[PDB]
Amino acid sequence: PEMVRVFDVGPRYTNLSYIGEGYGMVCSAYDNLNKVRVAIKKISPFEHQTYCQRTLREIKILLRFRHENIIGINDIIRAPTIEQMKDVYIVQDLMETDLYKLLKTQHLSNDHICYFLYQILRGLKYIHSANVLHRDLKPSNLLLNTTCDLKICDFGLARVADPDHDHTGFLTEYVATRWYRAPEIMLNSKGYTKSIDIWSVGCILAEMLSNRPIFPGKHYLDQLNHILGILGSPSQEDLNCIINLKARNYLLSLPHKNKVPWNRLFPNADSKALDLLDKMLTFNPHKRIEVEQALAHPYLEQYYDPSDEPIAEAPFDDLPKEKLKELIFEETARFQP
Numbered sequence: 001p002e003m004v005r006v007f008d009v010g011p012r013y014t015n016l017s018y019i020g021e022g023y024g025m026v027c028s029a030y031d032n033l034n035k036v037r038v039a040i041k042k043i044s045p046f047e048h049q050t051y052c053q054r055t056l057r058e059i060k061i062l063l064r065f066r067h068e069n070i071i072g073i074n075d076i077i078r079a080p081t082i083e084q085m086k087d088v089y090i091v092q093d094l095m096e097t098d099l100y101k102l103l104k105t106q107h108l109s110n111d112h113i114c115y116f117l118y119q120i121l122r123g124l125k126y127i128h129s130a131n132v133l134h135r136d137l138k139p140s141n142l143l144l145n146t147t148c149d150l151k152i153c154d155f156g157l158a159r160v161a162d163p164d165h166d167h168t169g170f171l172t173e174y175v176a177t178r179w180y181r182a183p184e185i186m187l188n189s190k191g192y193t194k195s196i197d198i199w200s201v202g203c204i205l206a207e208m209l210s211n212r213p214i215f216p217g218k219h220y221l222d223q224l225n226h227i228l229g230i231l232g233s234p235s236q237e238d239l240n241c242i243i244n245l246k247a248r249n250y251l252l253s254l255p256h257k258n259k260v261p262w263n264r265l266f267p268n269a270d271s272k273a274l275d276l277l278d279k280m281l282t283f284n285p286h287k288r289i290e291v292e293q294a295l296a297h298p299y300l301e302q303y304y305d306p307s308d309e310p311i312a313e314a315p316f317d318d319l320p321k322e323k324l325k326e327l328i329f330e331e332t333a334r335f336q337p
Protein backbone atom coordinates (compact mmCIF):
# COMPACT_ATOMS: atom_id res chain seq x y z
CA PRO A 1 0.00 0.00 0.00
CA GLU A 2 1.25 3.52 -0.82
CA MET A 3 2.04 5.90 2.02
CA VAL A 4 2.11 9.71 1.94
CA ARG A 5 3.68 12.03 4.54
CA VAL A 6 -0.89 5.48 5.28
CA PHE A 7 -3.03 5.85 2.12
CA ASP A 8 -4.93 2.74 1.07
CA VAL A 9 -6.62 3.29 -2.28
CA GLY A 10 -5.09 0.78 -4.65
CA PRO A 11 -4.86 -0.53 -7.14
CA ARG A 12 -7.19 1.80 -9.09
CA TYR A 13 -5.51 4.91 -7.73
CA THR A 14 -1.71 5.30 -7.95
CA ASN A 15 1.15 7.80 -7.94
CA LEU A 16 -0.05 9.83 -4.99
CA SER A 17 1.00 13.39 -4.14
CA TYR A 18 0.29 15.35 -0.98
CA ILE A 19 -2.04 18.34 -1.45
CA GLY A 20 -2.99 19.44 2.06
CA GLU A 21 -4.70 18.46 5.27
CA GLY A 22 -7.69 19.42 7.44
CA TYR A 23 -10.87 15.63 8.71
CA GLY A 24 -7.72 14.01 7.41
CA MET A 25 -5.42 14.52 4.50
CA VAL A 26 -5.94 15.14 0.82
CA CYS A 27 -3.81 13.83 -2.00
CA SER A 28 -3.96 13.74 -5.75
CA ALA A 29 -3.67 10.42 -7.50
CA TYR A 30 -3.85 8.84 -10.89
CA ASP A 31 -7.17 7.07 -11.62
CA ASN A 32 -6.10 4.10 -13.78
CA LEU A 33 -9.67 3.46 -14.83
CA ASN A 34 -10.50 6.94 -16.11
CA LYS A 35 -6.87 7.84 -16.97
CA VAL A 36 -6.93 11.17 -15.17
CA ARG A 37 -5.68 12.55 -11.88
CA VAL A 38 -8.21 12.91 -9.07
CA ALA A 39 -8.37 14.19 -5.52
CA ILE A 40 -8.62 11.70 -2.65
CA LYS A 41 -9.27 12.64 0.95
CA LYS A 42 -8.55 10.08 3.65
CA ILE A 43 -11.05 10.29 6.55
CA SER A 44 -10.54 8.57 9.90
CA PRO A 45 -13.71 9.46 11.85
CA PHE A 46 -14.93 6.45 13.76
CA GLU A 47 -13.69 7.28 17.26
CA HIS A 48 -15.27 10.72 17.67
CA GLN A 49 -19.04 10.79 17.16
CA THR A 50 -18.69 14.38 15.94
CA TYR A 51 -16.49 13.24 13.07
CA CYS A 52 -18.97 10.53 12.22
CA GLN A 53 -21.72 13.13 12.04
CA ARG A 54 -19.91 15.50 9.69
CA THR A 55 -18.73 12.55 7.54
CA LEU A 56 -22.21 11.03 7.24
CA ARG A 57 -23.74 14.42 6.37
CA GLU A 58 -21.24 15.20 3.65
CA ILE A 59 -21.55 11.73 2.10
CA LYS A 60 -25.32 11.57 2.21
CA ILE A 61 -25.88 15.02 0.77
CA LEU A 62 -23.22 14.91 -1.94
CA LEU A 63 -24.34 11.46 -3.17
CA ARG A 64 -27.89 12.79 -3.52
CA PHE A 65 -27.08 16.11 -5.18
CA ARG A 66 -26.16 16.33 -8.86
CA HIS A 67 -25.31 19.88 -9.99
CA GLU A 68 -22.54 21.48 -12.10
CA ASN A 69 -21.60 23.90 -9.26
CA ILE A 70 -21.53 21.32 -6.46
CA ILE A 71 -18.66 18.89 -6.09
CA GLY A 72 -19.55 15.31 -6.84
CA ILE A 73 -18.30 12.13 -5.15
CA ASN A 74 -16.80 9.89 -7.87
CA ASP A 75 -15.89 6.92 -5.68
CA ILE A 76 -15.60 5.93 -2.02
CA ILE A 77 -12.99 3.39 -0.91
CA ARG A 78 -13.26 1.42 2.32
CA ALA A 79 -12.81 -2.11 3.64
CA PRO A 80 -15.37 -4.80 2.74
CA THR A 81 -16.62 -5.24 6.31
CA ILE A 82 -17.48 -2.91 9.17
CA GLU A 83 -15.00 -4.79 11.38
CA GLN A 84 -12.14 -4.01 9.03
CA MET A 85 -13.31 -0.49 8.16
CA LYS A 86 -11.12 2.09 9.90
CA ASP A 87 -10.71 4.77 7.22
CA VAL A 88 -12.91 6.00 4.39
CA TYR A 89 -11.45 7.58 1.21
CA ILE A 90 -13.57 10.05 -0.78
CA VAL A 91 -12.58 10.47 -4.45
CA GLN A 92 -13.53 13.70 -6.25
CA ASP A 93 -12.58 15.46 -9.45
CA LEU A 94 -9.15 17.16 -9.13
CA MET A 95 -9.65 20.92 -8.83
CA GLU A 96 -6.68 23.25 -9.51
CA THR A 97 -7.32 25.52 -6.50
CA ASP A 98 -9.97 27.01 -4.22
CA LEU A 99 -11.09 30.58 -3.76
CA TYR A 100 -9.21 31.00 -0.45
CA LYS A 101 -5.89 30.01 -2.07
CA LEU A 102 -6.72 32.10 -5.13
CA LEU A 103 -7.49 35.27 -3.13
CA LYS A 104 -4.19 34.96 -1.23
CA THR A 105 -2.24 35.88 -4.34
CA GLN A 106 -4.48 36.79 -7.29
CA HIS A 107 -6.40 39.97 -8.01
CA LEU A 108 -9.76 39.10 -9.63
CA SER A 109 -11.06 41.01 -12.64
CA ASN A 110 -14.64 42.26 -12.38
CA ASP A 111 -15.47 39.64 -15.02
CA HIS A 112 -14.10 36.89 -12.72
CA ILE A 113 -15.96 38.25 -9.67
CA CYS A 114 -19.20 38.29 -11.58
CA TYR A 115 -18.71 34.75 -13.00
CA PHE A 116 -17.71 33.31 -9.62
CA LEU A 117 -20.67 34.94 -7.86
CA TYR A 118 -23.05 33.69 -10.55
CA GLN A 119 -21.75 30.13 -10.09
CA ILE A 120 -21.91 30.33 -6.28
CA LEU A 121 -25.54 31.44 -6.38
CA ARG A 122 -26.48 28.94 -9.10
CA GLY A 123 -25.21 26.14 -6.91
CA LEU A 124 -26.83 27.62 -3.83
CA LYS A 125 -30.18 27.83 -5.65
CA TYR A 126 -30.06 24.05 -6.04
CA ILE A 127 -28.99 23.48 -2.41
CA HIS A 128 -31.77 25.70 -1.08
CA SER A 129 -34.30 24.16 -3.44
CA ALA A 130 -33.59 20.84 -1.69
CA ASN A 131 -34.44 22.56 1.63
CA VAL A 132 -30.80 22.23 2.64
CA LEU A 133 -28.64 24.91 4.28
CA HIS A 134 -24.89 24.70 3.64
CA ARG A 135 -24.06 26.68 6.80
CA ASP A 136 -20.31 27.03 6.18
CA LEU A 137 -19.89 28.85 2.91
CA LYS A 138 -16.47 30.58 2.70
CA PRO A 139 -13.67 30.81 0.08
CA SER A 140 -11.93 27.58 1.08
CA ASN A 141 -15.18 25.67 0.38
CA LEU A 142 -15.37 26.89 -3.22
CA LEU A 143 -13.23 24.75 -5.49
CA LEU A 144 -12.01 25.99 -8.88
CA ASN A 145 -10.61 24.11 -11.87
CA THR A 146 -8.13 25.39 -14.51
CA THR A 147 -10.94 26.99 -16.49
CA CYS A 148 -12.54 28.63 -13.36
CA ASP A 149 -15.47 26.30 -13.10
CA LEU A 150 -16.60 26.69 -9.50
CA LYS A 151 -17.95 23.90 -7.28
CA ILE A 152 -19.25 24.20 -3.73
CA CYS A 153 -17.83 21.59 -1.37
CA ASP A 154 -17.87 20.52 2.33
CA PHE A 155 -21.43 19.92 3.55
CA GLY A 156 -20.28 18.62 6.92
CA LEU A 157 -22.21 21.33 8.79
CA ALA A 158 -25.24 21.31 6.50
CA ARG A 159 -28.79 20.95 7.90
CA VAL A 160 -32.38 20.74 6.67
CA ALA A 161 -33.92 24.20 6.90
CA ASP A 162 -36.10 24.69 9.98
CA PRO A 163 -37.36 28.27 10.21
CA ASP A 164 -39.98 27.56 12.84
CA HIS A 165 -37.28 26.54 15.31
CA ASP A 166 -34.70 29.25 14.47
CA HIS A 167 -35.04 31.42 17.60
CA THR A 168 -32.58 31.23 20.49
CA GLY A 169 -31.08 33.51 23.07
CA PHE A 170 -28.24 35.98 23.07
CA LEU A 171 -24.67 34.67 22.72
CA THR A 172 -25.69 31.10 21.84
CA GLU A 173 -22.66 29.11 20.83
CA TYR A 174 -22.22 28.40 17.13
CA VAL A 175 -19.83 26.15 15.15
CA ALA A 176 -19.56 27.44 11.54
CA THR A 177 -16.64 29.76 10.52
CA ARG A 178 -16.63 33.05 12.44
CA TRP A 179 -15.90 35.61 9.71
CA TYR A 180 -18.86 34.43 7.61
CA ARG A 181 -21.47 34.32 10.39
CA ALA A 182 -24.55 36.51 9.98
CA PRO A 183 -25.17 39.07 12.72
CA GLU A 184 -28.30 37.31 13.99
CA ILE A 185 -26.25 34.16 14.97
CA MET A 186 -24.87 36.21 17.85
CA LEU A 187 -28.23 37.72 18.73
CA ASN A 188 -31.16 35.31 18.38
CA SER A 189 -30.66 32.78 15.55
CA LYS A 190 -29.62 29.08 15.41
CA GLY A 191 -28.82 29.44 11.68
CA TYR A 192 -31.75 27.27 10.57
CA THR A 193 -32.94 29.51 7.71
CA LYS A 194 -31.70 30.05 4.18
CA SER A 195 -30.80 33.65 4.93
CA ILE A 196 -27.71 32.41 6.88
CA ASP A 197 -26.14 31.26 3.60
CA ILE A 198 -26.91 34.47 1.74
CA TRP A 199 -25.01 36.45 4.39
CA SER A 200 -21.99 34.19 3.89
CA VAL A 201 -22.15 34.75 0.09
CA GLY A 202 -22.24 38.51 0.70
CA CYS A 203 -19.08 38.16 2.77
CA ILE A 204 -17.47 36.16 -0.07
CA LEU A 205 -18.42 38.82 -2.59
CA ALA A 206 -16.89 41.55 -0.42
CA GLU A 207 -13.70 39.50 -0.09
CA MET A 208 -13.48 38.99 -3.86
CA LEU A 209 -13.66 42.78 -4.32
CA SER A 210 -10.70 43.51 -2.03
CA ASN A 211 -8.84 40.21 -1.32
CA ARG A 212 -9.36 40.61 2.45
CA PRO A 213 -12.21 39.40 4.67
CA ILE A 214 -14.73 42.15 5.24
CA PHE A 215 -15.55 41.18 8.88
CA PRO A 216 -12.45 39.51 10.41
CA GLY A 217 -13.66 39.23 13.99
CA LYS A 218 -11.07 37.86 16.40
CA HIS A 219 -13.57 36.20 18.76
CA TYR A 220 -17.31 35.59 19.12
CA LEU A 221 -18.83 39.00 20.05
CA ASP A 222 -16.05 40.82 18.14
CA GLN A 223 -17.58 39.44 14.99
CA LEU A 224 -20.79 41.36 15.67
CA ASN A 225 -18.91 44.57 16.32
CA HIS A 226 -17.08 44.34 12.94
CA ILE A 227 -20.42 43.89 11.21
CA LEU A 228 -21.95 46.88 12.98
CA GLY A 229 -18.84 48.99 12.32
CA ILE A 230 -19.65 48.86 8.59
CA LEU A 231 -23.43 48.48 8.48
CA GLY A 232 -23.92 51.03 11.28
CA SER A 233 -26.60 50.97 14.00
CA PRO A 234 -29.71 48.89 13.17
CA SER A 235 -32.92 50.86 12.60
CA GLN A 236 -35.71 50.94 15.14
CA GLU A 237 -37.73 48.66 12.87
CA ASP A 238 -34.97 46.10 12.71
CA LEU A 239 -34.47 46.17 16.47
CA ASN A 240 -38.18 45.75 17.01
CA CYS A 241 -37.91 42.44 15.10
CA ILE A 242 -35.58 41.17 17.80
CA ILE A 243 -37.95 40.31 20.62
CA ASN A 244 -35.35 38.82 22.90
CA LEU A 245 -34.55 41.49 25.51
CA LYS A 246 -30.93 40.52 26.18
CA ALA A 247 -30.12 40.74 22.48
CA ARG A 248 -32.12 43.91 21.93
CA ASN A 249 -30.72 45.72 24.97
CA TYR A 250 -27.18 44.81 23.93
CA LEU A 251 -27.74 46.60 20.64
CA LEU A 252 -29.42 49.56 22.38
CA SER A 253 -26.42 49.90 24.73
CA LEU A 254 -23.97 50.67 21.83
CA PRO A 255 -23.18 54.26 20.73
CA HIS A 256 -24.68 55.30 17.41
CA LYS A 257 -22.51 54.13 14.45
CA ASN A 258 -23.02 55.45 10.93
CA LYS A 259 -23.02 53.23 7.89
CA VAL A 260 -19.80 53.08 5.87
CA PRO A 261 -20.71 53.48 2.19
CA TRP A 262 -19.83 50.45 0.09
CA ASN A 263 -18.24 52.64 -2.61
CA ARG A 264 -15.90 54.13 -0.04
CA LEU A 265 -14.84 50.64 1.07
CA PHE A 266 -14.61 49.38 -2.52
CA PRO A 267 -13.88 52.38 -4.76
CA ASN A 268 -12.91 50.21 -7.77
CA ALA A 269 -15.99 47.97 -7.64
CA ASP A 270 -18.75 47.86 -10.20
CA SER A 271 -21.71 49.83 -8.86
CA LYS A 272 -24.12 46.98 -9.64
CA ALA A 273 -21.94 44.59 -7.65
CA LEU A 274 -22.16 46.91 -4.67
CA ASP A 275 -25.93 47.19 -4.94
CA LEU A 276 -26.21 43.38 -4.78
CA LEU A 277 -23.62 43.29 -1.97
CA ASP A 278 -25.77 45.67 0.05
CA LYS A 279 -28.80 43.43 -0.41
CA MET A 280 -26.92 40.30 0.70
CA LEU A 281 -25.33 42.03 3.67
CA THR A 282 -28.65 43.33 5.04
CA PHE A 283 -28.86 43.26 8.87
CA ASN A 284 -32.45 42.05 9.14
CA PRO A 285 -32.54 38.46 7.81
CA HIS A 286 -36.15 38.80 6.75
CA LYS A 287 -35.22 41.72 4.45
CA ARG A 288 -32.11 40.00 3.08
CA ILE A 289 -32.27 39.04 -0.60
CA GLU A 290 -33.01 35.39 -1.37
CA VAL A 291 -30.98 33.26 -3.78
CA GLU A 292 -33.34 33.47 -6.76
CA GLN A 293 -33.65 37.28 -6.43
CA ALA A 294 -29.90 37.54 -6.29
CA LEU A 295 -29.63 35.56 -9.54
CA ALA A 296 -32.07 38.01 -11.14
CA HIS A 297 -30.08 41.05 -9.99
CA PRO A 298 -28.78 43.35 -12.78
CA TYR A 299 -25.13 42.59 -11.80
CA LEU A 300 -25.65 39.03 -13.06
CA GLU A 301 -27.64 39.82 -16.20
CA GLN A 302 -24.95 38.49 -18.54
CA TYR A 303 -25.47 35.01 -17.04
CA TYR A 304 -29.01 34.89 -15.62
CA ASP A 305 -31.18 32.22 -17.16
CA PRO A 306 -33.65 30.55 -14.77
CA SER A 307 -34.22 27.68 -17.21
CA ASP A 308 -30.51 26.88 -16.94
CA GLU A 309 -30.43 27.19 -13.10
CA PRO A 310 -31.82 23.81 -12.08
CA ILE A 311 -33.42 22.77 -8.84
CA ALA A 312 -33.46 19.48 -6.94
CA GLU A 313 -35.89 16.73 -7.88
CA ALA A 314 -37.10 16.53 -4.29
CA PRO A 315 -36.14 18.03 -0.95
CA PHE A 316 -34.26 16.48 1.95
CA ASP A 317 -27.93 13.43 15.76
CA ASP A 318 -27.71 11.98 19.29
CA LEU A 319 -26.51 8.65 17.73
CA PRO A 320 -23.86 6.34 19.15
CA LYS A 321 -21.02 6.10 16.63
CA GLU A 322 -21.67 2.36 16.33
CA LYS A 323 -24.87 3.18 14.55
CA LEU A 324 -23.05 6.04 12.76
CA LYS A 325 -20.19 3.80 11.59
CA GLU A 326 -22.89 1.41 10.46
CA LEU A 327 -24.65 4.25 8.65
CA ILE A 328 -21.48 5.32 6.91
CA PHE A 329 -20.79 1.71 5.94
CA GLU A 330 -24.28 1.44 4.44
CA GLU A 331 -24.18 4.81 2.62
CA THR A 332 -20.95 3.85 0.92
CA ALA A 333 -21.97 0.35 -0.26
CA ARG A 334 -22.81 1.39 -3.82
CA PHE A 335 -19.08 1.78 -4.59
CA GLN A 336 -18.18 -1.84 -3.73
CA PRO A 337 -17.78 -4.56 -6.43
Ligand SMILES: C#CCNC(=O)CSc1nc2c(N)ncnc2n1[C@@H]1O[C@H](CN=[N+]=N)[C@@H](O)[C@H]1O
Pocket residue numbers: 019020021022023026039040041090091092093094095096097098143153154
Ligand atom coordinates in the same frame (compact mmCIF):
# COMPACT_ATOMS: atom_id res chain seq x y z
C1 LIG B 1 -11.49 14.13 -2.28
C2 LIG B 1 -12.02 14.81 -1.50
C3 LIG B 1 -12.77 15.63 -0.48
N1 LIG B 1 -12.58 17.08 -0.73
C4 LIG B 1 -12.71 17.92 0.29
O1 LIG B 1 -12.91 17.54 1.45
C5 LIG B 1 -12.51 19.41 0.02
S1 LIG B 1 -10.73 19.88 0.17
C6 LIG B 1 -10.14 19.66 -1.49
N2 LIG B 1 -10.86 19.06 -2.43
C7 LIG B 1 -10.12 19.08 -3.54
C8 LIG B 1 -10.37 18.64 -4.83
N3 LIG B 1 -11.51 18.00 -5.14
N4 LIG B 1 -9.36 18.86 -5.76
C9 LIG B 1 -8.18 19.53 -5.39
N5 LIG B 1 -7.98 19.95 -4.17
C10 LIG B 1 -8.92 19.75 -3.26
N6 LIG B 1 -8.96 20.09 -1.98
C11 LIG B 1 -7.85 20.82 -1.22
O2 LIG B 1 -7.29 20.08 -0.08
C12 LIG B 1 -6.63 21.08 0.87
C13 LIG B 1 -7.74 21.57 1.73
N7 LIG B 1 -8.31 20.43 2.47
N8 LIG B 1 -9.35 20.64 3.25
N9 LIG B 1 -10.41 20.86 4.03
C14 LIG B 1 -6.63 22.36 0.00
O3 LIG B 1 -5.59 22.48 -0.96
C15 LIG B 1 -8.00 22.25 -0.70
O4 LIG B 1 -7.95 23.10 -1.86
